[PDB]
Amino acid sequence: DDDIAALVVDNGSGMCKAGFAGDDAPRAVFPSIVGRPRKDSYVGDEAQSKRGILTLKYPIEHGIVTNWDDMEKIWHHTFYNELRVAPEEHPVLLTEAPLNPKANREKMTQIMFETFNTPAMYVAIQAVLSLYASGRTTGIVMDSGDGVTHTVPIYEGYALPHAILRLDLAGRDLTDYLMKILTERGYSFTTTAEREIVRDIKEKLCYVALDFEQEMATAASSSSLEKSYELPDGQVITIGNERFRCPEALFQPSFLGMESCGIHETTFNSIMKCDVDIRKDLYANTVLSGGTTMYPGIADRMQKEITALAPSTMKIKIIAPPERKYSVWIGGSILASLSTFQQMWISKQEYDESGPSIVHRKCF
Amino acid sequence: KSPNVLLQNLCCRILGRSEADVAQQFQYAVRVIGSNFAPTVERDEFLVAEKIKKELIRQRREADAALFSELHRKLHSQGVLKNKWSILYLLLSLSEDPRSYATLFAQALPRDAHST
Amino acid sequence: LVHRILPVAASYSAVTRFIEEKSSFEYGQVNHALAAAMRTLVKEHLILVSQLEQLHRQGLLSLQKLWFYIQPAMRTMDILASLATSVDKGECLGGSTLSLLHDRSFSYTGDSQAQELCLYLTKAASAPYFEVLEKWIYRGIIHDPYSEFMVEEHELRKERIQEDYNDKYWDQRYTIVQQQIPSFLQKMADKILSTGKYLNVVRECGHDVTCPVAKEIIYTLKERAYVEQIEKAFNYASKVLLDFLMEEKELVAHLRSI
Amino acid sequence: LRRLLVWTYDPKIRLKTLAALVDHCQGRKGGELASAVHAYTKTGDPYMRSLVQHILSLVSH
Amino acid sequence: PVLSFLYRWIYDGELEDTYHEFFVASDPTVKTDRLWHDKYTLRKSMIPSFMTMDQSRKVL
Amino acid sequence: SITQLFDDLCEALLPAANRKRAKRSLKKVAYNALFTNLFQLPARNKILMLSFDLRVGGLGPKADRLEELVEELEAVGSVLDLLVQLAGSGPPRDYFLNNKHVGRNVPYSGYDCDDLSVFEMDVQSLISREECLCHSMIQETLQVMEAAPGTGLPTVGL
Amino acid sequence: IRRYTDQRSLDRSFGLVGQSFCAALHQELREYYRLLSVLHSQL
Amino acid sequence: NLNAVRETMDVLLEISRILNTGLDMETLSICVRLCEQGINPEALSSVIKELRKATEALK
């Protein structure tokens, strides 16, 4: 780097982002999968290409661990295969999704200190890393990915987990609803390759307009939302209207079949549960986050709903980044370069002398 | 304090309202206090003393006109005010009669005949 | 070295006589305002030469230093003596001088000291002229004390001059002087003559000096606002006279009677 | 200060005007005097004009 | 001054001097209903070298 | 993102001449000072106090112009709050004012002769520059003509 | 230089670009007098 | 609309010029877009003054 360098590892559920601290892009980006057939032991592009003779599991699915073997295996293939660094010469910063229990943090550092034995570590939350790129210590962050979603109030650089609203949203559920509605429309969908094609067309070809009603009426009378797509496979599927009708669960959640509230209702009831004195302060720097920036154009509609939420006699100061999927990454990238961050960094001595639970207090 | 915030404190004394509400009058005050701020004419407290006497003669009250003399002496006995002329001129200008003209009555020297 | 400096003293000595002389009533009304505008550089000049004299007593000024200091003066005060000599050589009063300055206002650009000097003198000089213009364009008759304005009034409407001895007063009653045209009003000059001509016969029966412009006529180089004001007045003058003539004492009745 | 010529330049011009009406108007009183100060509002220098425009405001009271 | 003359020659205006600083050489008493034919000759010595010939002929 | 625009601000205050790696390290001092404040009366009255600070130092129309320009600025709101904090953080006549020989309907006030004294300072300021020049050319050469030899030449020092 | 820029500055036939050329020349000659003024005092 | 937000920023430039800041045209465009995100200007006052000092150590 520019000083004694560190490691940054973003353990998510859509993808695993790894690399050394002080690099603005991740040095390696792998998808979030476990080995051991349904290669012999591999995580990466090749494991996702051979998904049909392997198993797919996420280590953190919503903020709970499904299997100790699974979490240690995905961490192990991140630290030893995705980067291949020596643990004595680089300390590691680990991450956990917002609203995660303290015992999970203890189990996390218990894996990291036993299977690799580094002399120093850090465990941080994701929202503090997202806000630290935004150069502030205060704001409301709406993270919406493909396996987690939280509207996180963060005040004084410490997210209060009592006021974070947890919302289970997953991109697997999106792809599931896409399969159900393509079968309702009438379409062969029973294998993995068309799942890859359908996730490709929802990430890249799918359109989200600023208004729901106007474009839906116009495309229902004559589809100007359709465009012909001829892949190199030689398959022809298109409809514009239905792929814009599918992610409606943001406004009305009962379209996807979800039981919990929609996204605007979620941040609306969350700001109802924010303190009245801190409301204007959190709104003075409100940020978009989450992986849904994979198709850009969703942002304008997100800002419109946040403007409709709070009053308009207050002039909104909304921080609007172009890219907001590498937020956890760029947080650690800036943070480990500063030497003020090293005073909250935990050594091996406090882990052995004062137990595991000190990583909950010294790192945050 | 500094004078610039002190004029605001005056704008908050006489008007009850907040200073974010009334700012047109504070703007009108800042023009007139500025650029005519410091003394530029000759100060003399004795003429102002005799004019406080002439105001109290205009009420036909001769007792407080003799009380003013010992108060005017006490102002010089202590001597902790930089401009004795200003506050007596000020208080004389702000008089109110419970119950004339000044083109026959001669004022102070301007230091426009004298070099600044 | 002392010979090198004498042009600036020569270009002072031929202006200060001018400033006194052309400030009297005989020398125009614009030569007045011109000689008064060459006072502002004498102010600069006087205080510089005074303070440089007081600086010299300490030994902080010398001859070479003085020569180096007075270089921008050597341009600006030379140009004014050249201007005064050109005014003296062909004697111009009023509008004719206002052509001469208009020549001077293009004869230098790249100096940028001998441009701004003339650019200030030009706006100074057409303050007396454009206040005769502020009456003649909005009213019927001149109040010119001299005869150096571009229009000159005559009388063919008199006690002893009948209506069949003057026919129409387009004959000689309103004329334009030859060289008192300011030489940039040439395109409007005929309309300038026609305007107060329209206005006086509506003052003759009514009172109408009213206009929708009523704006102070000013000068700037490469400005044509003092064109548009004249055009806007010229429209309303002929409009009011034509509308008055065909309504009261109409030609509609008289033509059918012919 | 160059024998005080900084301070006396526009003096000798104002005063020259105030010495001209005081020679031109000799023995005039009454309306024949307001026929002799109204002959000096017909100047072209604004310095004399704004001076006589003040003197004539004084006399017409 | 070179761009000063080009403001009377990309907008309305005609060159005036006896000391030429700009290529236009108008032809006196040709100004009639026919001046879209040759009336303004292109004289090379007052063409500036920050314009090429295709530019210094198009402005005419 | 915004983290790139802080480095663009880091590029602006750097003049062009390592020297792209000093930039990324000055970017850290920019971040260490951004969170010092984050760790630990409307807009328009703050204009009035500085307009006052002008008007006491004379020069009245200049305050009259600053108020007119912030008036159309009040007709983006967060940046004037930065502008009132930075004041002196950077580097440390016409003949229609005091003349009555020109104008069109020029008023009358008689002589003032207390700006004629600041018309002598109008010359003293010109003299204070052209004496500072003769102070800045005899010093820049006495600093080189006086030393041991080999102080104005780096190649003698090797 | 002083000879050329003085012969072409009494020319009203050198035109307004030559009068700009010359204006630049006069500006450079003023700085040449600046030096010889400072040198004059050290003598 | 981009002509109007240009002229207002031009008006913004001059009143920071006569108050004698060190900010120029490009630093003002950076600072205006940074304030539009929701960044506290009271801290930007500190980071610009520290950066201009640490710049002089390089020269």
UniProtKB/Swiss-Prot annotation, chain B:
Organism: Homo sapiens
Subunit organization: Component of the gamma-tubulin ring complex (gTuRC) consisting of TUBGCP2, TUBGCP3, TUBGCP4, TUBGCP5 and TUBGCP6 and gamma-tubulin TUBG1 or TUBG2. TUBGCP2, TUBGCP3, TUBGCP4, TUBGCP5 and TUBGCP6 assemble in a 5:5:2:1:1 stoichiometry; each is associated with a gamma-tubulin, thereby arranging 14 gamma-tubulins in a helical manner. Gamma-tubulin at the first position is blocked by TUBGCP3 at the last position, allowing 13 protafilaments to grow into a microtubule.
Family named by the database record: Belongs to the TUBGCP family.
Name this polypeptide is given: Gamma-tubulin complex component 3
Domain of life: Eukaryota
Tissue-level expression: Ubiquitously expressed.
Role description: Component of the gamma-tubulin ring complex (gTuRC) which mediates microtubule nucleation. The gTuRC regulates the minus-end nucleation of alpha-beta tubulin heterodimers that grow into microtubule protafilaments, a critical step in centrosome duplication and spindle formation.
Compartments it resides in: Cytoplasm, Cytoskeleton, Microtubule organizing center, Centrosome
List of residues that carry Phosphoserine: 100
Swiss-Prot record, chain C:
Source organism superkingdom: Eukaryota
Subcellular location: Cytoplasm, Cytoskeleton, Microtubule organizing center, Centrosome
Effect on the protein of changing residue 75 to C: In CDCBM15; uncertain significance
Tissue specificity of this protein: Ubiquitously expressed.
Related illness: Cortical dysplasia, complex, with other brain malformations 15: An autosomal recessive disorder characterized by global developmental delay, variably impaired intellectual development, speech delay, facial dysmorphism, microcephaly, and varying degrees of cortical malformations including pachygyria, thin corpus callosum and subcortical band heterotopia. Most patients have generalized seizures.
Subunit structure and binding partners: Component of the gamma-tubulin ring complex (gTuRC) consisting of TUBGCP2, TUBGCP3, TUBGCP4, TUBGCP5 and TUBGCP6 and gamma-tubulin TUBG1 or TUBG2. TUBGCP2, TUBGCP3, TUBGCP4, TUBGCP5 and TUBGCP6 assemble in a 5:5:2:1:1 stoichiometry; each is associated with a gamma-tubulin, thereby arranging 14 gamma-tubulins in a helical manner. Gamma-tubulin at the first position is blocked by TUBGCP3 at the last position, allowing 13 protafilaments to grow into a microtubule.
Family according to the record: Belongs to the TUBGCP family.
Entry protein name: Gamma-tubulin complex component 2
Species this chain originates from: Homo sapiens
Gene name in the database record: TUBGCP2
From Swiss-Prot, chain F:
Compartment(s) of residence: Cytoplasm, Cytoskeleton, Microtubule organizing center, Centrosome
Domain of life the protein comes from: Eukaryota
Family per record: Belongs to the TUBGCP family.
Quaternary structure and interacting proteins, as annotated: Component of the gamma-tubulin ring complex (gTuRC) consisting of TUBGCP2, TUBGCP3, TUBGCP4, TUBGCP5 and TUBGCP6 and gamma-tubulin TUBG1 or TUBG2. TUBGCP2, TUBGCP3, TUBGCP4, TUBGCP5 and TUBGCP6 assemble in a 5:5:2:1:1 stoichiometry; each is associated with a gamma-tubulin, thereby arranging 14 gamma-tubulins in a helical manner. Gamma-tubulin at the first position is blocked by TUBGCP3 at the last position, allowing 13 protafilaments to grow into a microtubule.
UniProt disease annotation: Microcephaly and chorioretinopathy, autosomal recessive, 1: A syndrome characterized by microcephaly, cognitive impairment, underdeveloped retina and choroid, and epilepsy in some patients. The more anterior parts of the retina, near the periphery and pars plana, have a grayish hue and diminutive vasculature similar to retinopathy of prematurity. Visual impairment becomes evident during the first year of life.
Protein name: Gamma-tubulin complex component 6
The species this protein was found in: Homo sapiens
Protein encoded by which gene: TUBGCP6
Included range, full protein: 3 to 195 of 1819
UniProtKB/Swiss-Prot annotation, chain H:
Highest taxon above the source species: Eukaryota
Alphabetized UniProt keyword annotations: Acetylation, Cytoplasm, Cytoskeleton
GO cellular component terms, A-Z: centrosome; cytosol; gamma-tubulin ring complex; interphase microtubule organizing center; spindle
Compartmental location: Cytoplasm, Cytoskeleton, Microtubule organizing center, Centrosome; Cytoplasm, Cytoskeleton, Spindle
Signal peptide: none
Protein purpose: Required for the recruitment and the assembly of the gamma-tubulin ring complex (gTuRC) at the centrosome. The gTuRC regulates the minus-end nucleation of alpha-beta tubulin heterodimers that grow into microtubule protafilaments, a critical step in centrosome duplication and spindle formation.
Self-association and partners: Associates with the gamma-tubulin ring complex (gTuRC) consisting of TUBGCP2, TUBGCP3, TUBGCP4, TUBGCP5 and TUBGCP6 and gamma-tubulin TUBG1 or TUBG2; within the complex, interacts with TUBGCP3 and TUBGCP6 to form a luminal bridge with actin that stabilizes the initial structure during complex assembly. Interacts with TUBG1.
Protein name, UniProt field: Mitotic-spindle organizing protein 1
Residue window of the full protein shown: 17 to 75 of 82
